[PDB]
Design a protein around this ligand. Sequence first.
Ligand SMILES: Nc1ncnc2c1ncn2[C@@H]1O[C@H](COP(=O)(O)OP(=O)(O)NP(=O)(O)O)[C@@H](O)[C@H]1O
Ligand SMILES: CCCCCCCCCCCCCCCC(=O)O
Length: 539
Amino acid sequence: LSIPSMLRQCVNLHPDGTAFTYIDYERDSEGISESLTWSQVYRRTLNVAAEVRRHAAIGDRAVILAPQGLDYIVAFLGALQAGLIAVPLSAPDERVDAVVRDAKPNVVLTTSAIMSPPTVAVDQLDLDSPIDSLQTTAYLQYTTPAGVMITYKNILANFQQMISAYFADTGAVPPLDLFIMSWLPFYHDMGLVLGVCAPIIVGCGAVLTSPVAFLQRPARWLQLMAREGQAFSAAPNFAFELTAAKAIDDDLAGLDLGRIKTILCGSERVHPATLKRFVDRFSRFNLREFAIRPAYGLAEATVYVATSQAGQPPEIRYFEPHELSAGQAKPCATGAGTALVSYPLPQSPIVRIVDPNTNTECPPGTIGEIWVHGDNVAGGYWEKPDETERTFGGALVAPSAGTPVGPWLRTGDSGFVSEDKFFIIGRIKDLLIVYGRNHSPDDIEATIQEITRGRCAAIAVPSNGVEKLVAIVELNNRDTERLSFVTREVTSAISTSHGLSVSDLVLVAPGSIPITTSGKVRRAECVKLYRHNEFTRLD
Ligand SMILES: Nc1ncnc2c1ncn2[C@@H]1O[C@H](COP(=O)(O)OP(=O)(O)NP(=O)(O)O)[C@@H](O)[C@H]1O
Ligand SMILES: CCCCCCCCCCCCCCCC(=O)O
């Protein structure tokens, strides 16, 4: 039924089986491993549960403000065990403070190394001392801050959808020696569902580390995935880029990547050229290319919406770019126009492309907003009726045959269907509209990112009633001419490959463009930093 009861059943079936292994790289750059069997993580969970029942009642929120590691896991699991709504946050910002005010927690779970409601340092609890839950709301997944309410029903449904789609070629049964491997942060939906929940729900073990460790030496990702068994992992697109760029072959001495079962690529636009570099670079170590699975979803859907066909490598389709910017997907020849990853229309949940101004499905090939319906779709945002209604209350006008009327999750993403596959253009609010045509930041950035090889951000800045293109461009500092080579180069490439004039090319130092913990650009941030003149230009 719930995560706590599934955790207890893991304990009955395999008390001494390994459950969680955390590889810490902070003191020893080669890694220090610490591991918990099912019994051991259950004991700690129960001790955390008892400490938390002293400060808070069933139904209260419990904020988790710990660094990545084993204590985070038993803080979250212990909150669920005691019937609290867990609120996974990062370790200290201002967001953290606004989430606490929104969630009004009756307890905080933290660690001594970082410090009204009672704060608990779970590492200073006697967690291994020897020796209830809700059936509905498990935790709030925070993005003004809005916390997605995730129920056990949401979780169970997405896992049925995920296990069915990911393991369709083996009859929805994962292999006996599957293990999970993740460096994604536990306070993001991908990292929480994969790293903390999935080991319990699937009945497999997890090998875990921090996003900070991965960004230091991206080879550690490949190394830990190559451990004994068939690895299941996930990462954003540019983490594929980074690993392809920074890993050294001697770090990969005698690594066998041919047992890796799945690496999801999701949480941002999946670029075929990144995927091609990753497979070209690492096919030498037997990385099977059917192991790579583009995956689309969002926190409002718990995590999963759609993925590539199991047992095949990613499928790429090509469309006319000018037609795309005009709102129409016109297929073209392999290598022409713009390339997009094919996503098979999922069986569960279901996807529709919908005109956001008329609440009516688009004809195939017409670009509109991606709408989602299914039991994995959350019931709303915590204590936000109005915003819940705006985001979760999609109602279809004159639904097509078999298509439910509602309620539909409005994803905020632009996309289209072609040949019973759908494609994702990008986030609507990040699109650059010039002369009635929509252009995608992800495509412009690829254009720049090939000449720069540094990071990018293509943003729209309103001025006197139109949108102007501005490009924040990271670049390596270690003369005045090359700088004007790059300016000339990037400006022309955008013009020749997009028909756009760049109003402003902001050449900055590496690390000036804001990025996620997983490393993804923040485009709405980039905008008002530009608008409040907060960027320093290499001139
Ligand atoms: N496979 C994918 N392809 C394209 N876009 C994706 C994919 N997976 C996730 N996304 C995008 O990430 C969004 C949800 O990520 P979420 O964590 O819920 O908020 P976010 O961090 O603001 N992501 P984003 O702004 O898109 O980079 C989805 O709406 C998509 O915009
Ligand atoms: C076998 C267990 C599978 C566990 C998978 C959990 C992670 C699933 C990720 C699916 C796509 C994620 C994209 C949505 C996240 C986001 O963008 O906010």
